[PDB]
Amino acid sequence: MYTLNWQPPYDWSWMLGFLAARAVSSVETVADSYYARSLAVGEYRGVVTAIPDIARHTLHINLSAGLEPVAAECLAKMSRLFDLQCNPQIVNGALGRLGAARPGLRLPGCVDAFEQGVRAILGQLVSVAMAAKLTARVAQLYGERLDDFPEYICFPTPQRLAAADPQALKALGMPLKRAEALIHLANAALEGTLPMTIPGDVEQAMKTLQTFPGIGRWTANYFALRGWQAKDVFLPDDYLIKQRFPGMTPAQIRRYAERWKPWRSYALLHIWYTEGWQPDE
Amino acid sequence: MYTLNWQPPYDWSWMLGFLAARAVSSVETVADSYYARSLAVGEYRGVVTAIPDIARHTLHINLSAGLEPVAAECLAKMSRLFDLQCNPQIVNGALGRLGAARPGLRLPGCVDAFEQGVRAILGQLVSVAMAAKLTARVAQLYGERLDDFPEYICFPTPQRLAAADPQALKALGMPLKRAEALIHLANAALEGTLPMTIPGDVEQAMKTLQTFPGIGRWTANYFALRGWQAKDVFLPDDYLIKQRFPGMTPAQIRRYAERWKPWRSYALLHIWYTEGWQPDEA
Amino acid sequence: MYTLNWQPPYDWSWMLGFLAARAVSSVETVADSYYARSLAVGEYRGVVTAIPDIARHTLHINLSAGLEPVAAECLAKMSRLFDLQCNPQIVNGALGRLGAARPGLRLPGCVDAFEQGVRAILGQLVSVAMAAKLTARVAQLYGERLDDFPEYICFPTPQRLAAADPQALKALGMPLKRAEALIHLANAALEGTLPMTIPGDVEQAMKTLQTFPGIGRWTANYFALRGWQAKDVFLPDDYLIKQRFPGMTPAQIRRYAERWKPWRSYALLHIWYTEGWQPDE
Amino acid sequence: MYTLNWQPPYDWSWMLGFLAARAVSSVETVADSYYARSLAVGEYRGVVTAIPDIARHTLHINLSAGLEPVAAECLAKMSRLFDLQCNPQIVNGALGRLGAARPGLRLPGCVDAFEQGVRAILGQLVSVAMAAKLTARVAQLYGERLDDFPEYICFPTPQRLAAADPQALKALGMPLKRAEALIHLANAALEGTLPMTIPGDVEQAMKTLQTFPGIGRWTANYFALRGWQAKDVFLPDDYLIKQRFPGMTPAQIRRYAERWKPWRSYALLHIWYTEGWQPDEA
DNA sequence: GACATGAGTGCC
DNA sequence: GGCACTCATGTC
């Protein structure tokens, strides 16, 4: 029973719902009143269970004893996932109209940059429900099961996914060039060459990211947004985004989205999860 | 306020005593009952006071209003510095007669890898104290002061240090080379080339760190041990260490410490803080 | 005097007109009857005088006494400069109509690969007159003067351009990026990185040259043509060539030329000095 | 046919003698009175023949019909191979007593850097004789046999040795590292990485050369000597030279040889060919 | 201590 | 000889 604070408002329905859609089976359990998922901090494994208390602007978090040792980090990863630092008063006060409808919006982070990297790559070209399935199986194959909670399994580590048989992965339902992008990224992780935290110069780190085999501008962006919780990104090479800016080209979009600096990550979320939106005259 | 649990025993006097020796004026403050320093997380800043309660083997952390928005990432920082994850019954067991002198011995980590990167560099050649004096100058010079707390000053940030003139840093009391290194490290932080988190493959990653100008095996090993809290890395290159195996080569020494696997970071710490430990008269 | 012959025809009035245009004040003198310049081959320096004997198909090459110990290399420099190895029967008899008005057409080489390297970079963008004027400047600042020939000066060497001050080269009237290009090339020449002789895989080579900052595809081509006298390279990136093929783009052209392989470098010339030439629409 | 000049003295006996001993079969021929080998220059092949005229102080160069369009470059090649540019008064008058006995000594260049690389490589660890037979086999397989003079085959081109199976080369009588070395060399060759002419900064170039697999410091040196005809390199690594400097190590030798700058390459040849030469008492 | 560097030491 | 690998110097 640990507890963290958040500034109101906080749209849990939206947040959870979003995690739900993308929830990988066996690993994540998203329910209308709580989120709980397996988790590893090195060799310490167990299970996290966040339970927002909309009442007392607090997010209670329970930890399995196999993680009590690394309570701090765990507690810290959760805070990155649910964007607890956000001050909506500032963000919506900067976006106005755009964020005025759903002021409780928050940037859906992650509980580990490497997991996200994989999540990102596997999210390419396919749909959400589809990807959360392709991942589930990938987790199924290289994921450490919790001797303390068989039901849950840990996300494939970089070393586990580094010693990955390409055809083995490809045989799970992805081009080989995809599984090659992973085995690679997995290595970066191992040799600490993959920024596990948001860097000072994000533009750089991203360009630098766009070199990794299999990682392009859309993946690098979506990765900086979700993996580094970078607050000022935007995905103008995104299927959905293109539809919200009819005709407009990625450049036209990037150009446009500048009116929302320095909170383009949020402007983005407000546009994605807001059907029918369209640019101004 | 916020509190974190730990596994006894815990040599707080030793831990505080160690931190205080390397403390940097205007940035830290260590007493016998608590530790306190400035701290930055993103743009959020302020003060973290850490008070241990030996009776409840619990650490009470207090953040100034400036940090609450990133409280969690703060506690993580602290627990990493203090090594609260350590379970003495395991380490002390595996090492045995080695650390039984003081089992509460913990591995002093850091609250930030970059700062520790800067510290391990200026920590080159000079004495612990002198290194603490230099880091102080660079901090006073390139650090930012806290509004909420005038007295305190934040550690120099990566960007501020990248955009710094080698001469100025040189003038502080360090060779130009040393200064080029500080400035180099600063960018790997901005570019994200310098790991702020313990990488899966330490060995490799450390090797990679040595490609960096100013970072030899020693700075790599050490940084690995402090900045990442790596628990199975020995320092045969270290000064006092060569003096602990009087008349011995880094490979025999490094070959020696292989019995203390996989907690050579801990076996190392026990050697240092053992007034007169001479290799087992075998 | 020394003699080296050639296979007729040989348009000397054209060849000489060519070098004349790109002549470099103080390094070369060119009249309708002869070519002459300063020439260095290590610590051996002097003036090379070449006089064509159209009458009996032979080129006379006189050499200043300082170059006498390295006559052979001096003649090879001249032979490569004037493409005397050429056989107009083979080339012209493989270009057909394209090469019929001027069969005495030869491929203008160089006397020093590095020099041509420095020339190519400087020929970038500016016109021929300016390029020549510009190169003359660089020579004046960094070239060695001759004791027997005060009027002449040797083209600057790599040890001198590699140690040049970017800002000084900048001052001479060139983009800092450009001066940094000469200095980088100079360093390559010092390390043995710059191919001084037509390399096995011309294609590959040019690809490795483009990695040199300052060197693009046009520069890596004109350097190959003039610098290695490589006989099979086209230049759709070239201005005059661009328009010799109006409408056609650097792929259409590049494919059209395929028809001329492996003498595409000559093809390039004839089309260049044939004001009125049209492809087959 | 063509004639090139040279400054006296010129020890032809020594020179032809040196070339002969390393003469590769089917590629070159060496007789008391002349030197003749196959020569390719792009799509032009023929046979070059050199006959030194001691009276006129000239080297007569003959070329088979195939090479007449690239005649001058063939002369330029021969000139490098026979060190014709050398002014023995400069060297000897500076090299001191070292080469007073045989003032007509010259630097045996080569007629193609690549061939020379191949030869420096093939010649590692084995006797001059073995190297010759070794190379000969290599040439007889991947080389272009001339049609006008069947007993002559042009030394293998880059693109040819580049495509060679690392196993055939092994078959001819050599390890495998050695064979990949040639294929690596052949590759550097194709892309323009192997310097075919003496580089502006020799020391640098050698440093770089040693990065090539198969090429160490010896090979790197022996190549700068024969392959680029650099006049100021020494071989503190050669077996023979080590014997000429008893009990000294590459470092002492090299430092001792510094007394022969800028003509260290010549000093080397003199020493190499001096039964029982020995440094000065110390 | 970082780093250039010399030196010895086996193996392929 | 190339190459891996490890002591031991000698500036800064």
Next chain:
DNA sequence: GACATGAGTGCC
């Protein structure tokens, strides 16, 4: 969506 191509564009 990544990634070669090309083909154009525009800022040095």
Next chain:
DNA sequence: GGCACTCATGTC
């Protein structure tokens, strides 16, 4: 011209 970025485009 060198280049970094851009707007399709066909493939996987």
